């Protein structure tokens, strides 16, 4: 018979529910890092390719990857791009803004790791012909550009595996930090600009090379597309 | 400004966050549900607060930063019947219409949407945020352009410092301010706040807010007793305080006004604080019985001609009284006499 009171009470209770549901944005688990760990560990176990004894501070040395390159010649690598989805690659990291500040070392370690990746990719772009020469030493390969890009991104993936092996205990969050996001955005700008000013001799391998599931998973993860699992 | 007839607008204070539950597909004349959903946002920052998993109904979701377009007029918006479209707090004229309905959920009601349809979700018992200034507390600054980051702090903490980059255009500043003000009005207890901007810009922002609330009221929104206070009025309040008010109360303006509310009625006159707080637009008050305030006016208006002023307005009487007071006091100048002429009716 009456009106208003129902609507007013419902609106008030919904307002209280909204102010409570604000706090619902906390997350309980991440998946991107889990995919990273899964793919890295699977490839390492399947092919022992984790000759993981090198840091990102310098370019990888062909002395540690000659047989790796020889094996890589077996597969086809036309699916692999040339540039890097740096923003996409490092997006999972920003999610770990701990509530208040559990330990300030977390944020600074994140910043330091981001800048380390920045310098690593800058050096990789800077010494591109150097790597072309070093990997032509062991013998020419039709997909030499694919091999170089894959080697660089695989070294980076192994290093990121080791780095993030130390943080997965913590809790992610749906809302990434603003500061970390801005740093990542500007660094992605820098990296993409550095890579876009080059020329690459892409090769098409029309032979039906053997398709390894771990290889294709690693390829898709490298280009940071997480539609793999 | 003449809004197209396909737009549906919902306005509510609690739209600072995206309202996932309310988004639904639309059907064109083809009578086929469209599952490709496209969304727009003011700045790329808001993209980081739209879950791609909060839309189980829809097959695919594409997000874009709403960047103003010039090649298409608002009179005849472009039609893309291949995807539903839903806007969020738009700040420039809408230019793209999806199939069938096109909802626009916003917390700000500018001129561009005024002539569209409307469904306001009004609010109950809003809290009034408290404005003050430091001249003893742990000030907690907040990123105004992205308030969604500091939601927990806003819920919990008390002091807050509005902070704006110089990049932000006026419109985005207004939108962020409205977001934070709605957050406060939904808060469980009043929160203290200040702005780190030049005073003139603060006045411009408050004028914008006043006109926004005027439009909201003209579309039927429930009135809110919480509103900003003009800076000149603030200076008057500070002078009154310094004259007699020793401390700095949280709602000292409300304190003054209620301290005179206690006397408005029995003496039947406006407290001069209200008068100075306000050409024409003369204010009054009421009781359940029929009587005005300023002269004890009848409910109609200022009477046109009630009685002559022969005994007063004549220069002889005013001069005689002036000479009498001057002689009695020993003055030579500095005293002015005015006839009692503002006598509407006893």
């Amino acid at each position: 018979d009456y009106e208003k009171e129902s609507k007013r009470r419902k609106l008030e209770d919904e307002d209280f529910l909204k102010l409570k549901a604000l706090e619902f944005s906390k997350d309980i688990v991440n998946e991107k890092l889990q995919k990273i760990i899964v793919v890295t560990d699977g490839m390492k176990r399947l092919y022992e390719y984790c000759n993981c004894k090198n840091s990102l501070e310098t370019l990888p040395s062909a002395a540690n990857y000659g047989s790796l390159l020889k094996r890589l010649n077996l597969y086809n690598l036309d699916h692999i791009e040339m540039n890097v989805n740096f923003y996409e690659l490092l997006f999972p990291l920003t999610l770990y803004n701990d509530n208040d500040n559990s330990d300030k070392t977390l944020s600074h370690q994140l910043v330091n790791y981001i800048f380390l990746a920045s310098n690593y990719f800058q050096n990789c772009a800077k010494n591109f012909n150097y790597m072309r020469e070093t990997f032509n030493v062991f013998g020419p390969f039709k997909q030499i550009d694919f091999m170089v890009m894959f080697v660089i991104k695989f070294n980076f993936l192994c290093d990121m595996r080791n780095f993030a092996k130390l943080i997965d205990e913590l809790v992610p969050n749906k809302q990434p930090n603003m500061r970390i996001h801005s740093v990542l955005v500007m660094r992605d700008k820098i990296v993409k600009l550095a890579f876009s000013n080059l020329q690459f001799q892409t090769f098409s391998k029309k032979d039906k090379s053997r398709n390894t599931k771990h290889l294709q998973r690693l390829i898709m993860l490298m280009n940071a597309n997480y539609n793999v699992i | 400004m003449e809004c197209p007839f396909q737009i549906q607008v919902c306005i509510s204070d609690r739209f600072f966050a995206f309202p996932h539950n309310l988004v639904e597909p639309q059907s064109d004349v083809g009578n086929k549900l469209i599952e490709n959903l496209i969304v727009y946002v003011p700045t790329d920052d808001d993209r980081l607060y739209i879950d791609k998993k909060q839309f189980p109904k829809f097959n695919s979701v594409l997000v874009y930063r709403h960047e103003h377009d010039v090649n298409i007029d608002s009179r005849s918006p472009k039609k893309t019947a291949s995807a539903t479209i839903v806007y969020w707090n738009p700040l420039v004229p809408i230019t793209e219409i999806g199939a069938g309905e096109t909802r626009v959920f916003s917390v700000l009601l500018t001129n561009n949407l005024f002539y569209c349809n409307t469904m306001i979700v009004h609010h109950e018992n809003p809290k009034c945020p408290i404005e003050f200034t430091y001249p003893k507390s742990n000030l907690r600054p907040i990123a105004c352009e992205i308030p969604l980051s500091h939601f927990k702090e806003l819920v919990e903490s008390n002091d807050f410092l509005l902070c704006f980059n110089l990049e932000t255009s006026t419109m985005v500043k207004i939108l962020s301010l409205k977001r934070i003000f709605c957050i406060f009005q939904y808060r469980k207890q009043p929160a203290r706040y200040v702005i780190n901007l030049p005073h003139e810009e603060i006045d411009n922002l408050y004028n914008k807010l006043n006109w926004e609330r005027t439009r909201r009221l003209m579309k039927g929104d429930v009135p809110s007793n919480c509103a900003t206070v003009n800076r000149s009025s603030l200076k008057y309040i500070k002078q009154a305080q310094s004259l007699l008010g020793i401390p700095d109360y949280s709602q000292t303006v409300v304190d003054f006004v209620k301290m005179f509310q206690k006397i408005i009625f029995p003496y039947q006159l406006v407290p001069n604080v209200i008068i100075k707080l306000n050409l024409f637009c003369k204010n009054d008050s009421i009781a359940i019985s029929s009587s005005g305030i300023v002269p004890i006016n009848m409910p109609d208006f200022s009477p046109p001609n009630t009685f002559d002023y022969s005994d007063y307005a004549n220069r002889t009487n005013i001069n005689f009284v002036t000479q009498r007071v001057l002689t009695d006091g020993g003055f030579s100048s500095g005293i002015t006499v005015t006839p009692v002429k503002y006598n509407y009716y006893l």
Side-chain angles (χ1 to χ4, degrees), chain B residues 115-135:
Chain B
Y115 302 95
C116 311
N117 307 132
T118 302
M119 299 165 48
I120 292 177
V121 177
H122 40 271
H123 169 77
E124 174 71 7
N125 295 320
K127 298 295 188 180
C128 307
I130 289 174
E131 174 173 343
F132 66 154
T133 328
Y134 27 14

PDB file of all heavy atoms in Angstrom, chain B residues 115-135:
ATOM      1  N   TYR B 115      20.168  17.383 -21.499  1.00  0.00           N
ATOM      2  CA  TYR B 115      18.929  17.207 -22.241  1.00  0.00           C
ATOM      3  C   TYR B 115      18.639  15.752 -22.575  1.00  0.00           C
ATOM      4  O   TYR B 115      17.603  15.474 -23.186  1.00  0.00           O
ATOM      5  CB  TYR B 115      18.966  18.045 -23.519  1.00  0.00           C
ATOM      6  CG  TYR B 115      19.173  19.515 -23.246  1.00  0.00           C
ATOM      7  CD1 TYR B 115      20.440  20.076 -23.291  1.00  0.00           C
ATOM      8  CD2 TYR B 115      18.102  20.338 -22.934  1.00  0.00           C
ATOM      9  CE1 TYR B 115      20.634  21.416 -23.039  1.00  0.00           C
ATOM     10  CE2 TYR B 115      18.287  21.681 -22.681  1.00  0.00           C
ATOM     11  CZ  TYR B 115      19.553  22.213 -22.735  1.00  0.00           C
ATOM     12  OH  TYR B 115      19.743  23.553 -22.484  1.00  0.00           O
ATOM     13  N   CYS B 116      19.512  14.827 -22.197  1.00  0.00           N
ATOM     14  CA  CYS B 116      19.201  13.418 -22.358  1.00  0.00           C
ATOM     15  C   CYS B 116      18.155  12.992 -21.332  1.00  0.00           C
ATOM     16  O   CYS B 116      17.761  13.754 -20.447  1.00  0.00           O
ATOM     17  CB  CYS B 116      20.456  12.564 -22.200  1.00  0.00           C
ATOM     18  SG  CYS B 116      21.873  13.105 -23.168  1.00  0.00           S
ATOM     19  N   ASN B 117      17.708  11.747 -21.456  1.00  0.00           N
ATOM     20  CA  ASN B 117      16.885  11.152 -20.417  1.00  0.00           C
ATOM     21  C   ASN B 117      17.721  10.983 -19.152  1.00  0.00           C
ATOM     22  O   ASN B 117      18.919  11.276 -19.119  1.00  0.00           O
ATOM     23  CB  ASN B 117      16.316   9.818 -20.886  1.00  0.00           C
ATOM     24  CG  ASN B 117      15.598   9.930 -22.209  1.00  0.00           C
ATOM     25  OD1 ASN B 117      15.818   9.132 -23.115  1.00  0.00           O
ATOM     26  ND2 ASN B 117      14.737  10.931 -22.329  1.00  0.00           N
ATOM     27  N   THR B 118      17.086  10.509 -18.085  1.00  0.00           N
ATOM     28  CA  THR B 118      17.788  10.417 -16.815  1.00  0.00           C
ATOM     29  C   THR B 118      17.050   9.458 -15.893  1.00  0.00           C
ATOM     30  O   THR B 118      15.823   9.355 -15.933  1.00  0.00           O
ATOM     31  CB  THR B 118      17.921  11.795 -16.154  1.00  0.00           C
ATOM     32  OG1 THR B 118      18.612  12.694 -17.029  1.00  0.00           O
ATOM     33  CG2 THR B 118      18.681  11.708 -14.851  1.00  0.00           C
ATOM     34  N   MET B 119      17.821   8.746 -15.072  1.00  0.00           N
ATOM     35  CA  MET B 119      17.295   7.927 -13.978  1.00  0.00           C
ATOM     36  C   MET B 119      18.254   8.110 -12.805  1.00  0.00           C
ATOM     37  O   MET B 119      19.231   7.372 -12.667  1.00  0.00           O
ATOM     38  CB  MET B 119      17.170   6.465 -14.380  1.00  0.00           C
ATOM     39  CG  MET B 119      16.229   6.203 -15.536  1.00  0.00           C
ATOM     40  SD  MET B 119      16.477   4.558 -16.225  1.00  0.00           S
ATOM     41  CE  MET B 119      16.480   3.575 -14.728  1.00  0.00           C
ATOM     42  N   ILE B 120      17.968   9.090 -11.963  1.00  0.00           N
ATOM     43  CA  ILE B 120      18.831   9.388 -10.829  1.00  0.00           C
ATOM     44  C   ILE B 120      18.585   8.376  -9.723  1.00  0.00           C
ATOM     45  O   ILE B 120      17.439   8.068  -9.382  1.00  0.00           O
ATOM     46  CB  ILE B 120      18.591  10.822 -10.330  1.00  0.00           C
ATOM     47  CG1 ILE B 120      19.075  11.835 -11.361  1.00  0.00           C
ATOM     48  CG2 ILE B 120      19.297  11.053  -9.009  1.00  0.00           C
ATOM     49  CD1 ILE B 120      18.808  13.261 -10.962  1.00  0.00           C
ATOM     50  N   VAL B 121      19.667   7.846  -9.163  1.00  0.00           N
ATOM     51  CA  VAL B 121      19.603   7.019  -7.962  1.00  0.00           C
ATOM     52  C   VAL B 121      20.033   7.930  -6.817  1.00  0.00           C
ATOM     53  O   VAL B 121      21.217   8.070  -6.511  1.00  0.00           O
ATOM     54  CB  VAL B 121      20.478   5.774  -8.076  1.00  0.00           C
ATOM     55  CG1 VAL B 121      20.435   4.976  -6.784  1.00  0.00           C
ATOM     56  CG2 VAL B 121      20.015   4.920  -9.235  1.00  0.00           C
ATOM     57  N   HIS B 122      19.055   8.564  -6.177  1.00  0.00           N
ATOM     58  CA  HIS B 122      19.363   9.514  -5.122  1.00  0.00           C
ATOM     59  C   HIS B 122      19.871   8.782  -3.882  1.00  0.00           C
ATOM     60  O   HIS B 122      19.908   7.551  -3.818  1.00  0.00           O
ATOM     61  CB  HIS B 122      18.143  10.376  -4.806  1.00  0.00           C
ATOM     62  CG  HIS B 122      16.851   9.623  -4.803  1.00  0.00           C
ATOM     63  ND1 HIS B 122      16.090   9.454  -5.939  1.00  0.00           N
ATOM     64  CD2 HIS B 122      16.182   9.004  -3.804  1.00  0.00           C
ATOM     65  CE1 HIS B 122      15.008   8.759  -5.640  1.00  0.00           C
ATOM     66  NE2 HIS B 122      15.038   8.473  -4.351  1.00  0.00           N
ATOM     67  N   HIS B 123      20.262   9.562  -2.880  1.00  0.00           N
ATOM     68  CA  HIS B 123      20.991   9.053  -1.729  1.00  0.00           C
ATOM     69  C   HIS B 123      20.302   9.478  -0.439  1.00  0.00           C
ATOM     70  O   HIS B 123      19.557  10.460  -0.401  1.00  0.00           O
ATOM     71  CB  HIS B 123      22.444   9.545  -1.752  1.00  0.00           C
ATOM     72  CG  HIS B 123      23.186   9.288  -0.481  1.00  0.00           C
ATOM     73  ND1 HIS B 123      23.670   8.044  -0.142  1.00  0.00           N
ATOM     74  CD2 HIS B 123      23.508  10.111   0.543  1.00  0.00           C
ATOM     75  CE1 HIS B 123      24.271   8.115   1.033  1.00  0.00           C
ATOM     76  NE2 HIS B 123      24.185   9.358   1.470  1.00  0.00           N
ATOM     77  N   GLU B 124      20.561   8.721   0.623  1.00  0.00           N
ATOM     78  CA  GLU B 124      19.940   8.934   1.921  1.00  0.00           C
ATOM     79  C   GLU B 124      20.985   9.358   2.945  1.00  0.00           C
ATOM     80  O   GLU B 124      22.049   8.738   3.043  1.00  0.00           O
ATOM     81  CB  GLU B 124      19.230   7.665   2.393  1.00  0.00           C
ATOM     82  CG  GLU B 124      18.673   7.747   3.803  1.00  0.00           C
ATOM     83  CD  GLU B 124      17.471   8.663   3.906  1.00  0.00           C
ATOM     84  OE1 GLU B 124      16.988   9.141   2.858  1.00  0.00           O
ATOM     85  OE2 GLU B 124      17.000   8.900   5.038  1.00  0.00           O
ATOM     86  N   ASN B 125      20.672  10.407   3.698  1.00  0.00           N
ATOM     87  CA  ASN B 125      21.474  10.851   4.834  1.00  0.00           C
ATOM     88  C   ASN B 125      22.965  10.975   4.511  1.00  0.00           C
ATOM     89  O   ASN B 125      23.793  10.273   5.100  1.00  0.00           O
ATOM     90  CB  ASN B 125      21.262   9.923   6.021  1.00  0.00           C
ATOM     91  CG  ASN B 125      19.846   9.971   6.549  1.00  0.00           C
ATOM     92  OD1 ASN B 125      19.238  11.038   6.623  1.00  0.00           O
ATOM     93  ND2 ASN B 125      19.310   8.814   6.915  1.00  0.00           N
ATOM     94  N   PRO B 126      23.340  11.853   3.585  1.00  0.00           N
ATOM     95  CA  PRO B 126      24.761  12.024   3.279  1.00  0.00           C
ATOM     96  C   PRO B 126      25.509  12.670   4.434  1.00  0.00           C
ATOM     97  O   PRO B 126      24.965  13.487   5.181  1.00  0.00           O
ATOM     98  CB  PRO B 126      24.749  12.937   2.049  1.00  0.00           C
ATOM     99  CG  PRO B 126      23.492  13.721   2.194  1.00  0.00           C
ATOM    100  CD  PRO B 126      22.496  12.780   2.813  1.00  0.00           C
ATOM    101  N   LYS B 127      26.773  12.286   4.576  1.00  0.00           N
ATOM    102  CA  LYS B 127      27.669  12.928   5.523  1.00  0.00           C
ATOM    103  C   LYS B 127      28.312  14.143   4.873  1.00  0.00           C
ATOM    104  O   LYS B 127      28.562  14.165   3.666  1.00  0.00           O
ATOM    105  CB  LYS B 127      28.752  11.961   5.997  1.00  0.00           C
ATOM    106  CG  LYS B 127      28.229  10.742   6.727  1.00  0.00           C
ATOM    107  CD  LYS B 127      27.552  11.126   8.025  1.00  0.00           C
ATOM    108  CE  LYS B 127      27.213   9.893   8.848  1.00  0.00           C
ATOM    109  NZ  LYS B 127      26.547  10.239  10.133  1.00  0.00           N
ATOM    110  N   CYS B 128      28.575  15.164   5.684  1.00  0.00           N
ATOM    111  CA  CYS B 128      29.217  16.365   5.179  1.00  0.00           C
ATOM    112  C   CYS B 128      30.700  16.313   5.506  1.00  0.00           C
ATOM    113  O   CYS B 128      31.062  16.350   6.692  1.00  0.00           O
ATOM    114  CB  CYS B 128      28.585  17.615   5.785  1.00  0.00           C
ATOM    115  SG  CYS B 128      26.788  17.728   5.627  1.00  0.00           S
ATOM    116  N   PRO B 129      31.586  16.222   4.517  1.00  0.00           N
ATOM    117  CA  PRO B 129      33.020  16.265   4.812  1.00  0.00           C
ATOM    118  C   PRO B 129      33.405  17.607   5.411  1.00  0.00           C
ATOM    119  O   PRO B 129      32.787  18.636   5.136  1.00  0.00           O
ATOM    120  CB  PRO B 129      33.673  16.051   3.444  1.00  0.00           C
ATOM    121  CG  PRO B 129      32.645  16.501   2.464  1.00  0.00           C
ATOM    122  CD  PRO B 129      31.321  16.136   3.072  1.00  0.00           C
ATOM    123  N   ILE B 130      34.437  17.586   6.243  1.00  0.00           N
ATOM    124  CA  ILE B 130      34.838  18.748   7.024  1.00  0.00           C
ATOM    125  C   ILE B 130      36.087  19.360   6.411  1.00  0.00           C
ATOM    126  O   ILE B 130      37.114  18.686   6.274  1.00  0.00           O
ATOM    127  CB  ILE B 130      35.082  18.365   8.491  1.00  0.00           C
ATOM    128  CG1 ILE B 130      33.754  18.057   9.187  1.00  0.00           C
ATOM    129  CG2 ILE B 130      35.836  19.468   9.199  1.00  0.00           C
ATOM    130  CD1 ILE B 130      33.914  17.526  10.589  1.00  0.00           C
ATOM    131  N   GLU B 131      36.010  20.643   6.066  1.00  0.00           N
ATOM    132  CA  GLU B 131      37.157  21.381   5.558  1.00  0.00           C
ATOM    133  C   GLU B 131      37.772  22.216   6.671  1.00  0.00           C
ATOM    134  O   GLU B 131      37.061  22.829   7.472  1.00  0.00           O
ATOM    135  CB  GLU B 131      36.764  22.285   4.389  1.00  0.00           C
ATOM    136  CG  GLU B 131      37.893  23.194   3.923  1.00  0.00           C
ATOM    137  CD  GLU B 131      37.553  23.963   2.667  1.00  0.00           C
ATOM    138  OE1 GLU B 131      36.593  23.572   1.975  1.00  0.00           O
ATOM    139  OE2 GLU B 131      38.249  24.959   2.372  1.00  0.00           O
ATOM    140  N   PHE B 132      39.097  22.235   6.710  1.00  0.00           N
ATOM    141  CA  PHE B 132      39.847  22.935   7.742  1.00  0.00           C
ATOM    142  C   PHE B 132      41.195  23.319   7.150  1.00  0.00           C
ATOM    143  O   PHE B 132      41.402  23.251   5.936  1.00  0.00           O
ATOM    144  CB  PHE B 132      39.990  22.081   9.010  1.00  0.00           C
ATOM    145  CG  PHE B 132      40.839  20.832   8.839  1.00  0.00           C
ATOM    146  CD1 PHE B 132      41.496  20.279   9.929  1.00  0.00           C
ATOM    147  CD2 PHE B 132      40.973  20.206   7.606  1.00  0.00           C
ATOM    148  CE1 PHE B 132      42.268  19.140   9.787  1.00  0.00           C
ATOM    149  CE2 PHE B 132      41.745  19.071   7.463  1.00  0.00           C
ATOM    150  CZ  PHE B 132      42.393  18.539   8.556  1.00  0.00           C
ATOM    151  N   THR B 133      42.096  23.774   8.008  1.00  0.00           N
ATOM    152  CA  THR B 133      43.475  24.010   7.620  1.00  0.00           C
ATOM    153  C   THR B 133      44.373  23.800   8.833  1.00  0.00           C
ATOM    154  O   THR B 133      43.957  24.018   9.975  1.00  0.00           O
ATOM    155  CB  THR B 133      43.681  25.422   7.044  1.00  0.00           C
ATOM    156  OG1 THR B 133      42.496  25.833   6.356  1.00  0.00           O
ATOM    157  CG2 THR B 133      44.843  25.432   6.052  1.00  0.00           C
ATOM    158  N   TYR B 134      45.608  23.375   8.570  1.00  0.00           N
ATOM    159  CA  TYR B 134      46.540  23.065   9.654  1.00  0.00           C
ATOM    160  C   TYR B 134      46.816  24.243  10.587  1.00  0.00           C
ATOM    161  O   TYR B 134      46.835  24.026  11.812  1.00  0.00           O
ATOM    162  CB  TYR B 134      47.845  22.451   9.111  1.00  0.00           C
ATOM    163  CG  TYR B 134      48.330  22.760   7.690  1.00  0.00           C
ATOM    164  CD1 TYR B 134      47.816  23.796   6.927  1.00  0.00           C
ATOM    165  CD2 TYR B 134      49.347  21.995   7.121  1.00  0.00           C
ATOM    166  CE1 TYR B 134      48.263  24.056   5.662  1.00  0.00           C
ATOM    167  CE2 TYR B 134      49.811  22.250   5.847  1.00  0.00           C
ATOM    168  CZ  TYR B 134      49.260  23.287   5.126  1.00  0.00           C
ATOM    169  OH  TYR B 134      49.693  23.578   3.858  1.00  0.00           O
ATOM    170  N   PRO B 135      47.028  25.491  10.118  1.00  0.00           N
ATOM    171  CA  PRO B 135      47.362  26.466  11.153  1.00  0.00           C
ATOM    172  C   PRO B 135      46.126  27.092  11.777  1.00  0.00           C
ATOM    173  O   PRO B 135      45.745  26.642  12.856  1.00  0.00           O
ATOM    174  CB  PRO B 135      48.171  27.513  10.388  1.00  0.00           C
ATOM    175  CG  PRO B 135      47.511  27.542   9.053  1.00  0.00           C
ATOM    176  CD  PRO B 135      46.918  26.156   8.807  1.00  0.00           C
TER     177      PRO B 135
END
